[PDB]
C-alpha cells in the first residue's frame, strides 16, 4: 500500500499473507470461513519456472501483523489443499480476477484470526464511499514490501470515470477505488487481499479483491479491484460459505 500507515495490532484479523516457497510474502488473501480464503486468480498463474498454480508451493499465515515476527503468539500457519480460480479469469485482461483457497487445516478464531462477512449479490458500495485496502505490498512503485501490515483509506470512484481513466481496460467486474490525485493506492504484493468496507455500525463487509493498477498511487490512475458481490453465488456454490 502506497501512502498508507501502520495498521494497529489485530485491526484486520481477516487479512492473510500468502508465502510462496523461497520467496517470502507474494500475495494477500481474505479469511471468509474456517476452511476458505478469498484471493486473486492472477496470483496463482505459473510464472518464472515456479508453479504458482500449485497449492503445495504455498503457505498461508493468519493473525500475522509483522513479516519479521511470524512466530508471534496468534500467528497461525496453514498449508493449502486447493486453489479454485474463476473459470472466466482471463490473464490478458484480468477480467474475473478472483480465486478461492482451501485450507488444509482450519483456522481457529482468536483476537488475531477472525472472518470477514461476504456481501450479497445485491450489495452496493456507492461512489464516494471511504473504504480500506490493507497489505504487505510495496510502499512505493518499484519499492519494498512493508514489514508491518499497511492500511490505506481510499474512496469508490464511479464506473463512468473509471472507464474514462482506464479506457478499454475496465469491465463490469471491476471497480476503481482511490483518488484522482493519486497518492494513496494499492501496489505490488497487495494483490488478492481484502478491500474492506467498515460501516459506521460496526459491521464489516468485503467490498472487493485487490486486482491491478496502472502503476501505483499515480494521478488519475487509482487501483482496480474485483467487485465481490457479483461472485456470491459462485462462492457459495464452490465453497459452501
Amino acid at each position, epitope marked *: 500500500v502506497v501512502g498508507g500507515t501502520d495498521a494497529d495490532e489485530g485491526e484486520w484479523p481477516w487479512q492473510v499473507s500468502l508465502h510462496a516457497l523461497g520467496q517470502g510474502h507474494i500475495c494477500g488473501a481474505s479469511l471468509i470461513s474456517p476452511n476458505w480464503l478469498v484471493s486473486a486468480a492472477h496470483c496463482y498463474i505459473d510464472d518464472r519456472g515456479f508453479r504458482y498454480s500449485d497449492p503445495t508451493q504455498w503457505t498461508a499465515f493468519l493473525g500475522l501483523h509483522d513479516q519479521s515476527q511470524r512466530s508471534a503468539p496468534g500467528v497461525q500457519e496453514r498449508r493449502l489443499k486447493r486453489i479454485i480460480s474463476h473459470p472466466f479469469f482471463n490473464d490478458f485482461t484480468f477480467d474475473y480476477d478472483i480465486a478461492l483457497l482451501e485450507l488444509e487445516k482450519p483456522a481457529e478464531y482468536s483476537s488475531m484470526v477472525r472472518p470477514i462477512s461476504l456481501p450479497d449479490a445485491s450489495h452496493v458500495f456507492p461512489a464516494g464511499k471511504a473504504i480500506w485496502v490493507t497489505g504487505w505490498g510495496h510502499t512505493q512503485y518499484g519499492g519494498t514490501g512493508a514489514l508491518i501490515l499497511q492500511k490505506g483509506e481510499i474512496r469508490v470512484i464511479n464506473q463512468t470515470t473509471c472507464e474514462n481513466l482506464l479506457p*478499454q481496460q475496465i469491465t463490469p467486474r471491476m471497480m476503481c477505488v482511490g483518488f484522482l490525485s493519486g497518492g494513496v493506492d494499492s501496489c505490488q504484493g497487495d494483490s488478492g487481499g481484502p478491500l474492506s468496507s467498515v460501516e459506521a455500525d460496526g459491521r464489516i463487509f468485503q467490498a472487493g479483491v485487490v486486482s491491478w*493498477g496502472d502503476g501505483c498511487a499515480q494521478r488519475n490512475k487509482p487501483g482496480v479491484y474485483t467487485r465481490l458481490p457479483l461472485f456470491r453465488d459462485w462462492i457459495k456454490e464452490n465453497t459452501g460459505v
Partner: antibody
Amino acid sequence: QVQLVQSGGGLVKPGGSLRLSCAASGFTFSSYAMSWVRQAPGKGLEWVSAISGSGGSTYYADSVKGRFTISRDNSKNTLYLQMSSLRAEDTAVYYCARPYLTYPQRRGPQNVSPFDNWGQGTMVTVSS
Amino acid sequence: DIQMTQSPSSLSASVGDRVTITCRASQGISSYLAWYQQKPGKAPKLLIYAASSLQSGVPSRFSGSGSGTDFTLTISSLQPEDFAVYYCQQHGNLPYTFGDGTKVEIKR
C-alpha cells in the same frame, strides 16, 4: 539484452501448413503476452494474433481466425504460430513482438500496449 | 474495427528540416497511439507510445502530440539516417491497427 530469435518459414503449397517459432531470451518470457504481426510484400503491418503470458487466452484477427493457432511453451521460452489452410494472401513476413509495459514492476493486464521488441522476421511464401 | 489514416503517403525533406506527419483514427482512441520507424529489411522500431511518450534511447528530435482521433509525429530536424517508413498504430482495441505508412525520403 532482450532478444527474440525466430525460425521457420519457407515455401508452402496453398492449403498446406507451417509452424513458425520465436525463441525468446533476456527477460522473463512467461510474464509477457506476445503477438505475431505480419507484413505483405511492399505493404503495411497487420496484427495477426496474441497470447497471454500463460497461454490461457488467445486472440486472432478476422482474416486469420480458425486457420491459425498461436501457442507457447514457457519452459522453452518459445512462441509458436501454426498456419493452416494457407492462401495466397498469407504470403508475408511474420514477426513476433513483445508488448511495451509502462509500469512493469506491478503486474496487471497487458491489453493496451504497442510493441517494444520484435524478432527479425520470417518470410513465408505460399505458392504452387 | 478502427481505421487509421496517414498523411501524407510520402514526402521528401531536406536535412535539418522540420517534418510533420499526421495520423487519423476513425473513432476516438484516447491517447493509445504509437509511432514506429521501419527501415528497409528491418523490424519496426518503437519511437513514441501513448501519443506523446518517447521510448528511451530514441533521439530527442522525435516527438508526438494528439488526442482522440487526431495525432502528429514531428521530426524537428531531419537526419539522413531518418530515411524510413513511419507507421502509426492504435494500441487500444483489438485488432490493433496500423496506419498505411508515411515514406520519408531525404532531399539532397
